[PDB]
Design a protein around this ligand. Structure first.
Ligand SMILES: CC1(N)CCN(c2cnc3c(-c4cccc(Cl)c4Cl)c[nH]c3c2)CC1
Length: 500
């Protein structure tokens, strides 16, 4: 849980918080109330507050006077372990997170909800240790912790307990003992130190009640319901990114600094693609900014090549036996290189280090170009394999497509290509940093794959899938707009399947 993030605060409320409850070096982050993808880092320095803008248009968090980051938690970790200056050059220190007490972005918080409502949800969907916190209806201002415990039919082996939580002078308690500054501090305490009943039952808080898993048949109702919040479901997912600060030590090595498009957007050690059979004369020849994404068909999520990583990209494709590449940027957007050209012109042949690529044929569709490429190792003719590059060309410079039909038709074609090729390795997917559009395309592909095989009567869970992909590369799916677009794409896919 991301405690320095305050979801429902104004700029002057942030100032007053830092001036009355903080010291120099205190900080918090907050969203804008009107623009998603605008965020502010508010910091106290010399008895005054500075507000530093962070923009996200879809590719990364861009901190004014700072770096680009995959997540706000990775941003805060970076500066608390390092570097941040104003317009002028004066150091801004991030020392002390100012904690937020607001529970409304927690997975377990249900606001207005009755005991019988909570019981029926825990009976229908909960299991042992499933829990929620709700507002007390009998005692205004108070709250109730509802917990299922049991074995795992309705044979009385399981039950729902309700523990009253008093709120007294803005502190929270369960009738005795410690008084907490927030419901989150209380929940974390009793997660670690569970309550035991008189006769021995342990009220284990194992997991919040799942409210996001839906039957695919019922996508339209969920989308209609979320259109009046997508922002609120997204920000609850974003609150969990504190849990995904896995090590990125290889990417952080001096010898690998030049191989990262953005110095702080780095692959997790535990899922990075390790490159073998490198040049012995190159000191570190095993690194690429790329991760294996395995749903729990696989993917490699990677960045747009740099001039000096083109040969490594082709080493990767050959080694992993990838037969399909998805590119989700033009080479240049808004005057900036987003991905260098790493393929030859049509009918041309180029050598990229030890690899040889022929561009056999390009075919233009409305939304994309297909390039049929032939990849082989120089000196070894029988290593030739076809690699099909699907270059999506119509994604807008900021935000998302207004209709998902283009992306869905593209992904359907990519899927059938991949499935047509026996023993094809992972599908390579890359944009600019390889986390925003790349994460959106991979998550849509994962969700659609379920419905393709199991039909419309299968369970999907959009944020749970995203969190699972985010544990394999930082910040996969960057914005609310992409989040909503994933739902919209899944909805549109379900409707075309129902029309058949
Ligand atoms: C009544 C509610 N306020 C409605 C929103 N509810 C809700 C629950 N879960 C999530 C997740 C989620 C799902 C699966 C795994 C992970 Cl890690 C996450 Cl974060 C993302 N957004 C969520 C919103 C919480 C109750």
């Amino acid at each position: 849980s991301r405690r320095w993030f305050h979801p429902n605060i104004t700029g002057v409320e942030a100032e007053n918080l830092l001036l009355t409850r903080g010291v120099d070096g205190s900080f918090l982050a907050r969203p804008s109330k009107s623009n998603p993808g605008d965020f502010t880092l508010s910091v106290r320095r010399n008895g005054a507050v500075t507000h530093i803008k962070i923009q996200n248009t879809g590719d990364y968090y861009d901190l004014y006077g700072g770096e680009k980051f995959a997540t706000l938690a990775e941003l805060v970790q970076y500066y608390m372990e390092h570097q941040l200056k104003e317009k002028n050059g004066d150091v801004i220190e991030l020392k002390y997170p100012l904690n937020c007490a607001d529970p409304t972005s927690e997975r377990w918080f249900h606001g207005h909800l009755s005991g019988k409502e909570a019981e029926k949800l825990l009976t229908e969907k909960g299991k042992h240790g499933s829990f929620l916190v709700r507002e007390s209806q009998s005692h205004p201002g108070d709250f109730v912790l509802s917990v299922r415990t049991g074995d795992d039919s309705n044979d009385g082996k399981s039950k729902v307990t309700h523990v009253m939580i008093r709120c007294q002078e803005l502190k929270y308690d369960v009738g005795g003992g410690e008084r907490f500054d927030s419901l989150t501090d209380l929940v974390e305490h009793y997660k670690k130190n569970p309550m035991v009943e008189t006769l021995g039952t342990v009220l284990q808080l194992k997991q919040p009640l799942n409210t996001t898993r839906i039957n695919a048949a019922e996508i339209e109702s969920r989308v209609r319901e979320l259109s009046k919040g997508f922002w609120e479901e997204f920000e609850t997912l974003q609150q969990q990114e504190c849990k995904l600060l896995y090590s990125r030590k290889e990417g952080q090595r001096q010898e690998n600094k030049n191989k990262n498009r953005y110095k702080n957007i780095l692959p997790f050690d535990h899922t990075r693609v390790v490159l073998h059979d490198g040049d012995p004369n190159e000191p570190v020849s095993d690194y690429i900014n790329a991760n294996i994404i395995m749903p729990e068909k696989s993917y490699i999520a990677t960045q747009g090549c740099l001039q000096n990583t083109v040969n490594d990209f082709w080493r990767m494709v050959f080694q992993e036996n990838s037969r399909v590449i998805v590119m989700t940027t033009k080479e240049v957007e808004r005057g900036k290189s987003k991905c260098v050209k790493y393929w030859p012109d049509e009918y041309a042949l180029k050598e990229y280090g030890v690899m040889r690529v022929r561009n056999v044929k390009e075919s233009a569709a409305h939304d994309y170009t297909l390039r049929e490429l032939k990849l082989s190792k120089v000196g070894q003719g029988n290593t030739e394999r076809t690699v099909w590059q699907y270059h999506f060309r119509t994604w807008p410079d900021h935000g998302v497509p207004s209709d998902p039909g283009g992306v869905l038709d593209f992904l359907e074609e990519v899927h059938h290509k991949q499935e047509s090729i026996m023993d094809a390795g992972p599908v390579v997917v890359h944009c600019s940093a390889g986390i925003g559009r790349t994460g959106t395309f991979i998550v849509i592909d994962i969700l659609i794959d379920i419905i393709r095989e199991k039909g419309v009567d299968c369970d999907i869970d959009v944020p749970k899938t995203i969190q699972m992909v985010r544990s394999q590369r930082s910040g996969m799916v960057q914005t609310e707009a992409q989040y909503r677009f994933i739902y919209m794409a899944v909805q549109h896919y379900i409707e075309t399947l129902q029309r058949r």
